[PDB]
Structure formats: structure tokens, C-alpha cells
Write a protein that binds this ligand. Structure first.
Ligand code: BMG
Ligand code: CL
Length: 265
């Protein structure tokens, strides 16, 4: 079968947009990229890094994983499936951060950015602190999802996402028990079954976080993959289209992931 360079180019032509890819075989250090340094909108995918930042703070004894977070007076954001359920009782910080990741919960994300992580600019400073110079969060969860062509707000690159996921999930930034907790959160993500997970054999373990801006066909997924009997892989796939009414494509993301996994092997 064809080199990845040919398959990814034809896929991108079919998709009528742009596809950005970076994948890492962590057992060799081999990498595959296409548009890997190009900015793409994060959409909700930054929430998986917000969850990791909460766990970094817990490891440092800067937050309590079990502190109760109450929000009985909040007007909860659209797409807050878990915080909606707990509005009367509150949630622990850890459970709220888990929901920000696994359900893309907007209320969980914005409450944690308002109270603990210093807003979009605080989230951005956390990413700088771990050596990610590309990520930028300019707006709040939900608010950020405009995906306008040419707009640099709320972007990163496929490579910086992959490198940051590697750092956060595989033992660089998260050093204590919180590393396994973060891996568990990623593994239980609920929104990615049609994306990178669809490209991976079922007897490999995967954790991921998605994003779907809902405009300009813009959507993404990143994943840590634990194959049987080999070191982890990291896969980061980001997409855009040029007309506001274009829809995103799960099958394009899964395909780009298949191509990337073949390339790094
Ligand atoms: C984040 O990108 C988005 C929210 N997060 C997710 C998600 O990652 O599943 C949903 S996107 C929704 C529309 N769509 C297309 N394919 C899958 N999905 C799920 C919500 C809305 C922003 C708006 O917070
Ligand atoms: Cl969002």
C-alpha cells in the first residue's frame, strides 16, 4: 500500500479542507507528521489538558482532589451533561475535572478555569510551563468554538498537542498516582468511539479527548494508545474546512489516524 504522503494528500483532497497529523511511536522515537506545525483550532480538546493541569496541582498539594466544588447559583453552559446532574450537591474537584475530559463538560471546564486555573490565560501559562510554546487559549470553554479561518485564537499545532499529551500522560509532568488517574480518565473518555479509537485494534487500550467546534467542519482527536506487547503510541489529528456550514468528518479523522499509525511502524 501507498506511502503515507500519498494517502494523506488524497484524503485531504477528498475531505475538502485541511488535515493536520502528528504521531509518535514512543518505543523508537519515530514520528509522522503532515501540517504538523500548522495551527488548528483546539475546540474542546484543550479540556484534556485542563484535566491534567488539575492533577498536576493535586500532586503538588496545591489543590485537594476531594475538595467540594459547589455551583448552585450558576447558569450552566450548554453541553454540561455531568455538572447538570450534580447541580444541587456539587462535585469533588477530581470528579469535575474527570467530567471536563470524559464528557467535554463545559460547566466543569469553566468552573475549574474560573476558580483554580486562572482562566484561558492561566491555562495557557500552564502549557508554557511544560514547554508547549504553541498552545494558546484565548476564550472560555464553549465561547471559543468559532473556528474562523485565519483566526489564531484558541489554536495549537498537531505536534505540540502530541508532545504535550506525551508529557502529561506518560510520566514527565505527572509523576505521582495522579499519572495513572489521568490515564484512566483518558481511557474512559466517552466521545471518541468513531475517531482514533476506530482505527485501533480492539485489544489495544486507548485513551483520548475529542473536539468538535460545530463550524467550518472543524474537529479533532488526540490519543494515547497502549498496544499489546509494545511501547505506547501518541496520535494527534486536527481538521478544518473553509465554509462555515461545512460539517466535520469522523471517518476522515479515523482514516488519518490509521495512516499515521501505519507510518510510524
Ligand atoms: C467541544 O469540542 C465541544 C463539546 N465537546 C464535545 C465533544 O468533544 O464531544 C461536544 S461536540 C458534539 C458535536 N459533535 C460532532 N461529532 C461529535 N460531536 C459531539 C460538545 C458540544 C464544545 C462546543 O464545547
Ligand atoms: Cl469548548
Amino acid at each position: 500500500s501507498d506511502a503515507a504522503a500519498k494517502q494523506i494528500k488524497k484524503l485531504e483532497e477528498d475531505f475538502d479542507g485541511r488535515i493536520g497529523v502528528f504521531a509518535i511511536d514512543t518505543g523508537s522515537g519515530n514520528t509522522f507528521g503532515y501540517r504538523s506545525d500548522e495551527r488548528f483550532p483546539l475546540c474542546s480538546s484543550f479540556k484534556g489538558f485542563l484535566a491534567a493541569a488539575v492533577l498536576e496541582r493535586v500532586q503538588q498539594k496545591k489543590l485537594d482532589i476531594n475538595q467540594k466544588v459547589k455551583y448552585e447559583s450558576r447558569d450552566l453552559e450548554y453541553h454540561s451533561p455531568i455538572t447538570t446532574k450534580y447541580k444541587g450537591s456539587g462535585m469533588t474537584l477530581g470528579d469535575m475535572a474527570s467530567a471536563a475530559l470524559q464528557y467535554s463538560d463545559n460547566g466543569a471546564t469553566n468552573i475549574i478555569m474560573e476558580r483554580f486555573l486562572g482562566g484561558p490565560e492561566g491555562m495557557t501559562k500552564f502549557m508554557r510551563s511544560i514547554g508547549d510554546n504553541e498552545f494558546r487559549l484565548d476564550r472560555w470553554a464553549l465561547e471559543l468554538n468559532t473556528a474562523i479561518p485565519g483566526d489564531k485564537r484558541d489554536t495549537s499545532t498537531p505536534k505540540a498537542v502530541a508532545n504535550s499529551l506525551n508529557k502529561l500522560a506518560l510520566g514527565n509532568v505527572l509523576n505521582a498516582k495522579v499519572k495513572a488517574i489521568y490515564q484512566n480518565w483518558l481511557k474512559g473518555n466517552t466521545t471518541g468511539d468513531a475517531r482514533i479509537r476506530a482505527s485501533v485494534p480492539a485489544d489495544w487500550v486507548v485513551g483520548d479527548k475529542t473536539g468538535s467546534c460545530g463550524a467550518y467542519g472543524t474537529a479533532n482527536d488526540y490519543a494515547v494508545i497502549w498496544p499489546k506487547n509494545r511501547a505506547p503510541l501518541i496520535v494527534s489529528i486536527y481538521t478544518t474546512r473553509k465554509s462555515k456550514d461545512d460539517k466535520h468528518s469522523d471517518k476522515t479523522i479515523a482514516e488519518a489516524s490509521r495512516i499515521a499509525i501505519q507510518a510510524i511502524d
